[PDB]
C-alpha cells in the first residue's frame, strides 16, 4: 500500500555472540538519532535483526538543515540565487522535493558531530552492527512508473524530471543518457541497414558515418547534460568534495592557508598500492589472451575437421561458450578490482568512484573486446602464428587459409549471444531467484503487511548505477569500433535500448532497494571512456575496412586509411565543437537573464579655484598650464582665435 511516514530504515543486526556490545551500542544509536532531531521507532527484524525507522519530527530542524544546505550550495556556486533570509517562508516559493529531503535526512544521519549530524556511517565507528541505511520504495509510484513507461513508445523530459524528483540526480542522469543514446542510435541503425542492404560488406563510408555519429552524439550529450545540470540546479556539485568515511589516516595536519584540520595520508603509500594495478592488468591480459587464443584455435580445428552437417553453426561454439562464461570471470575480476580499490585508500568519494570506474572499464574492455581484436587484427593479417595450438589439438584428437570475412560472422554470434546472456543474468535469472525466494515461504496485527514489506526490502541489493553505465559504454564501444563488420548490430542494440529503459527501471522497481539520492553534475568519468571509445573507433573500424576488403595487403595502405580516418575524426570533432558552441543553449541564456536581473562647469571651476588657493598657499607651471583658462566659454573663443590666426599666415 503506502509507507507509514518512514523516511529512513536502519537494519542493525544484533548477533548473539556479541549481543551486549551490540545492545548498549543500540542505545547509543538512539542517542545518535535523538540529538539530531529524528523520531525513532524500533520494530522486530527477521533473521536475528532489529529494525529501526526514523522520520523528521520537528520541522524547524529540518528547515534549518534545508537553509544550511542551500547556503552550502551558495558558497560553492551551485545555487546562484539568494539562499534564505534566516527564516523559512521561502520554501513555498521553491518547494522541497522528496529526493533532496531524503538526501538531507541521510546527511543528518551520516555526517559527523561537528557539522550538525551524528554519523552512523556503518564502517568506521563503534556502530559496526549497522550495515544498511535505506529509504523505502513507493509501490504505487513504482507501479504507475512501470505502467506509464511500458505503454509509451518514447519518453519525454517530464518522466526524467519525475525520476529526478523521486530517486535523485544520478538515476535521472543515467535515464537521460540512456534515452539520448537510444534516440541517437536510430542514425547508425538506418545507415547500418543501408550499408547491409546496398553497400555490400566492409564499407569505408559506414566507418566514416560511425565516426561522425560518435562525435555528434558525444558533444550533443555534453551539451544536453550541461542543460540538464542547469535545469535541475546541480551545476557544479562535482566541485563539492565529499569526505569518505572509510578513509584511513594517521596524521591530522592543518591546512596551510585556512587552518581546518585535514586528515592526510602519505601519497607514496597510495602510489605504492596503485602500482599493483600493472601486474593485475598484465596478468588479466595474459590469462584472457591465452583463453581467447585457445578458443579460436579450437574453433579453427573444428572448422578443419568437422565436415558436413553444421560447419557454419559449429564453428563459433568456443566463441558462444566464451560469451556465456564471461559474466562469471567478469564478476571475479570486478570483485578483485573492488578489493584493490578498497585497499587503495581514497579521501574523497569522487576520486574513489573514478578510480573504480577506470579499473572496471579496463577489465570489461579486455573481456568484451579482446576476442574481436584478436580476430580482426591478429588472425586476419597473419594467421600462421597459432599453428602449434592446432598441433596440440591434432595430437589430442589422435588419442590452410584465413577467411577475411570472419570478423563479420563472429561479430553476429558475438552480439546475438551477448544480447541473450545479458538478458539472462540481469532480467530473468533474478526473476527466477526472487520467485524461488517467494515460494520458499505478532507485528501488532495492523502493520504486519508494512513490516513484512520492509523485511523483504532489506534483503535486496543496493542499486548500482555504474554497472548500467558500464553496459551502455561497452555497447557504444561495439557500435563505434566493431559495427563495420556487421552493420545490423546497432539496430539490435536499438531494440535492446528500448527494453533497457524499461527493464533497468524494473530493476529499480522490484529487484532493488531504493538508492540514496545523490547529486551529480554529469555522468562523470564514463564521458572520458566514451571519448576514448570514439577515438579508437576511428583507428579500429576503418582498419577493418582495409583488412577485410583485401591480392596481398600493404602496410602503407593500412597506415593511410588509419591516418585519414583519425584525422577525419579530429576535424569532425573540431567542427562539431565549433558548431555546438553557437547554438545558444537555454542554460547560458537563463544565466544572462539572471545576470541582467541581479552644472559640471561650476564643479570644475570650484576644483580649479581650490587648486588656485593651494598654489597661493605655497609646481608653478604645472598649475599655470591649466589656471590660465578655466571656464567653458573662454576655451571656445581662444580655440576660435587659434583657428582664425592659424590661417592668417
Ligand X SMILES: CCCCCCCC/C=C\CCCCCCCC(=O)O[C@H](COC(=O)CCCCCCCCCCCCCCC)COP(=O)(O)OC[C@@H](O)CO
27 in contact with a second copy (CB under 8 A): yes
Would you give the DSSP letter of residue 343? H
Hey, what's the cell of 396?
Answer: 589430442
Stretch that binds a second copy, among 170-178, 218-226, 359-367, 626-634 (CB under 8 A): 626-634
Hey, what's the cell of 53?
Answer: 525507522
Least Å distance, CB 533 to a second copy, is 16
Of 39 and 421, CB closest to Ca ion: 421
> CB-based contacts of 70: which residues, under 8 Å, 6+ apart?
79, 83, 84
Task: Confirm or deny that 606 is annotated as ligand binding.
Answer: no
Q: Is 596 in contact with 236 (CB distance < 8 Å)? A: no
Task: Confirm or deny that 504 is annotated as ligand binding.
Answer: yes
Would you give the DSSP letter of residue 514? P
521 in contact with Ca ion (CB under 5 A): no
Report the 10 Å Cβ neighbour count for 347.
Answer: 19
Least Å distance, CB 432 to a second copy, is 32
Hey, what's the cell of 54?
Answer: 526514523
Q: Which does 365 bind (CB under 5 to 8 A by kind): a second copy, ligand X, Ca ion, none?
A: ligand X
Instruction: Give the C-alpha separation, 110 to 57, whole Å.
Output: 18
Q: Is 116 in contact with 36 (CB distance < 8 Å)? A: yes
581 in contact with ligand X (CB under 6 A): no
Question: Which of positions 74-113 make contact with a second copy (CB under 8 A)?
Answer: 75-76
Please identify which residue in the block is written with the cell numbers 538506418.
190
Q: Considering only residues 388, 440, 646, 648, which one is a binding residue for a second copy as defined by CB under 8 A?
A: 646
Q: Is 67 in contact with 84 (CB distance < 8 Å)? A: yes
Of 136 and 185, CB closest to a second copy: 136
Task: Confirm or deny that 500 is annotated as ligand binding.
Answer: yes
- Beta partners for residue 263, in sequence order: 252
Single out the residue of 371, 368, 349 nearest to residue 360, CA to CA. 368
Question: Which of positions 492-551 make contact with ligand X (CB under 6 A)?
Answer: 525, 528-529, 532, 539-540, 543
Using a 10 angstrom Cβ sphere, with 0-12 exposed, 13-18 middle and 19 or more buried, the burial of residue 346 is buried
Q: Is 302 in contact with 317 (CB distance < 8 Å)? A: yes
Stretch that binds ligand X, among 10-18, 37-45, 101-109, 385-393 (CB under 6 A): 385-393
Task: Confirm or deny that 100 is annotated as ligand binding.
Answer: no
Least Å distance, CB 244 to a second copy, is 19
625 in contact with a second copy (CB under 8 A): yes
In the shown chain, the binding pattern of residues 224 to 243 toward ligand X, with x for contact by CB under 6 A and - for none, equals --------------------
443 in contact with a second copy (CB under 8 A): no
Strands (E), 261-384: 261-264
> CB-based contacts of 145: which residues, under 8 Å, 6+ apart?
162, 505, 509
Instruction: Give the C-alpha separation, 613 to 305, whole Å.
Output: 116
649 in contact with ligand X (CB under 6 A): no
271 in contact with ligand X (CB under 6 A): no
Binding site residues for Ca(2+), as ranges?
422, 426, 468, 471, 500, 504
Footprint of ligand X (CB under 6 A): 190, 193-194, 197-198, 276, 279-280, 283-287, 289-290, 293, 295, 318, 321-322, 324-325, 328-329, 332, 336, 339-340, 354, 357-358, 361-362, 365, 377-378, 381, 385-386, 388-389, 525, 528-529, 532, 539-540, 543, 553-556, 558-560, 562
Amino acid at each position: 500500500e503506502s509507507n507509514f511516514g518512514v523516511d529512513f530504515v536502519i537494519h542493525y543486526k544484533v548477533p548473539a555472540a556479541e549481543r551486549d556490545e551490540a545492545e548498549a551500542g543500540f542505545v547509543q544509536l538512539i542517542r545518535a538519532l535523538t540529538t539530531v532531531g529524528l523520531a525513532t521507532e524500533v520494530r522486530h527484524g527477521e533473521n536475528e535483526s532489529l529494525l529501526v525507522f526514523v522520520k523528521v519530527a520537528s520541522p524547524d530542524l529540518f528547515a534549518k538543515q534545508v537553509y544550511r544546505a542551500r547556503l552550502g550550495d551558495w558558497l560553492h556556486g551551485v545555487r546562484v540565487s539568494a539562499p534564505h533570509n534566516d527564516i523559512a517562508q521561502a520554501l513555498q516559493d521553491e518547494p522541497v522535493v522528496e529526493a533532496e529531503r531524503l538526501r538531507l535526512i541521510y546527511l543528518m544521519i551520516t555526517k559527523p558531530h561537528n557539522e550538525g549530524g551524528a554519523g552512523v556511517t556503518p564502517t568506521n565507528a563503534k556502530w559496526k552492527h549497522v550495515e544498511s541505511i535505506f529509504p523505502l520504495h513507493s509501490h504505487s509510484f513504482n507501479k504507475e512508473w512501470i505502467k506509464k513507461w511500458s505503454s509509451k513508445y518514447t519518453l519525454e523530459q517530464t518522466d526524467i524530471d519525475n525520476i529526478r524528483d523521486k530517486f535523485g540526480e544520478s538515476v535521472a542522469f543515467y535515464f537521460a543518457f540512456l534515452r539520448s543514446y537510444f534516440r541517437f542510435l536510430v542514425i547508425p541503425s538506418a545507415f547500418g541497414f543501408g550499408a547491409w542492404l546496398l553497400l555490400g560488406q566492409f564499407s569505408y563510408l559506414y566507418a566514416l558515418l560511425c565516426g561522425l555519429w560518435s562525435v555528434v552524439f558525444f558533444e550533443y550529450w555534453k551539451k544536453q547534460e550541461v542543460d540538464l545540470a542547469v535545469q535541475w540546479g546541480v551545476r557544479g556539485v562535482s566541485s563539492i568534495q565529499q569526505s569518505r568515511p572509510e578513509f584511513e589516516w594517521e596524521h591530522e595536519a592543518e591546512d596551510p592557508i585556512t587552518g581546518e584540520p585535514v586528515k592526510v595520508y602519505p601519497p607514496m603509500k597510495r602510489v605504492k598500492t596503485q602500482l599493483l594495478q600493472i601486474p593485475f592488468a598484465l596478468a588479466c591480459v595474459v590469462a584472457l589472451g591465452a583463453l581467447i587464443v585457445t578458443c579460436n584455435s579450437l574453433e579453427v580445428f573444428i572448422n578443419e575437421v568437422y565436415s558436413g552437417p553444421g560447419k557454419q553453426y559449429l564453428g563459433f561454439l568456443p566463441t558462444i561458450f566464451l560469451v556465456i562464461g564471461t559474466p562469471t570471470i567478469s564478476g571475479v575480476l570486478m570483485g578483485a578490482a573492488e578489493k584493490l580499490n578498497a585497499m587503495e585508500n581514497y579521501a574523497t568519494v569522487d576520486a574513489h568512484d573514478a578510480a573504480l570506474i577506470q579499473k572496471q572499464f579496463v577489465l570489461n574492455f579486455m573481456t568484451s573486446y579482446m576476442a574481436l581484436f584478436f580476430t580482426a587484427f591478429v588472425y586476419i593479417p597473419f594467421g600462421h602464428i597459432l599453428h602449434p595450438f592446432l598441433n596440440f589439438w591434432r595430437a589430442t584428437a589422435q588419442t590452410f587459409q584465413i577467411n577475411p570475412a570472419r570478423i563479420s560472422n563472429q561479430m553476429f554470434y558475438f552480439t546475438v549471444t551477448a544480447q541473450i546472456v545479458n538478458f539472462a543474468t540481469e532480467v530473468v535469472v533474478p526473476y527466477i531467484k526472487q520467485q524461488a525466494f517467494q515460494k520458499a515461504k505478532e507485528d501488532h496485527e495492523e502493520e504486519a503487511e508494512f513490516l513484512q514489506r520492509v523485511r523483504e526490502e532489506c534483503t535486496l541489493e543496493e542499486y548500482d548505477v555504474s554497472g548500467d553505465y558500464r553496459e551502455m559504454v561497452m555497447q557504444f564501444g561495439y557500435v563505434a569500433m566493431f559495427s563495420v563488420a556487421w552493420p545490423l548490430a546497432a539496430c539490435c542494440f536499438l531494440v535492446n535500448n528500448w527494453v533497457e529503459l524499461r527493464s533497468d527501471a524494473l530493476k529499480i522497481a522490484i529487484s532493488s532497494r531504493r538508492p540514496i539520492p545523490w547529486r551529480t553534475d554529469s555522468i562523470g568519468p564514463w564521458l572520458t571512456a566514451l571519448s576514448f571509445l570514439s577515438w579508437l573507433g576511428s583507428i579500429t573500424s576503418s582498419a577493418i575496412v582495409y583488412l577485410c576488403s583485401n591480392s596481398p595487403l600493404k602496410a602503407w595502405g593500412l597506415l593511410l586509411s588509419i591516418l585519414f580516418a583519425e584525422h577525419f575524426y579530429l576535424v569532425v570533432q573540431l567542427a562539431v565543437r565549433f558548431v555546438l558552441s553557437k547554438l545558444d543553449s537555454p542554460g547560458l541564456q537563463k544565466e544572462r537573464k539572471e545576470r541582467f536581473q541581479t552644472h559640471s562647469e561650476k564643479i570644475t571651476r570650484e576644483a580649479l579655484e581650490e587648486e588656485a588657493r593651494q598654489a597661493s598657499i605655497r609646481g608653478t607651471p604645472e598649475e599655470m598650464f591649466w589656471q590660465r583658462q578655466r571656464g567653458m566659454q573662454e576655451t571656445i573663443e581662444i580655440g576660435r582665435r587659434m583657428i582664425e590666426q592659424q590661417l592668417a599666415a
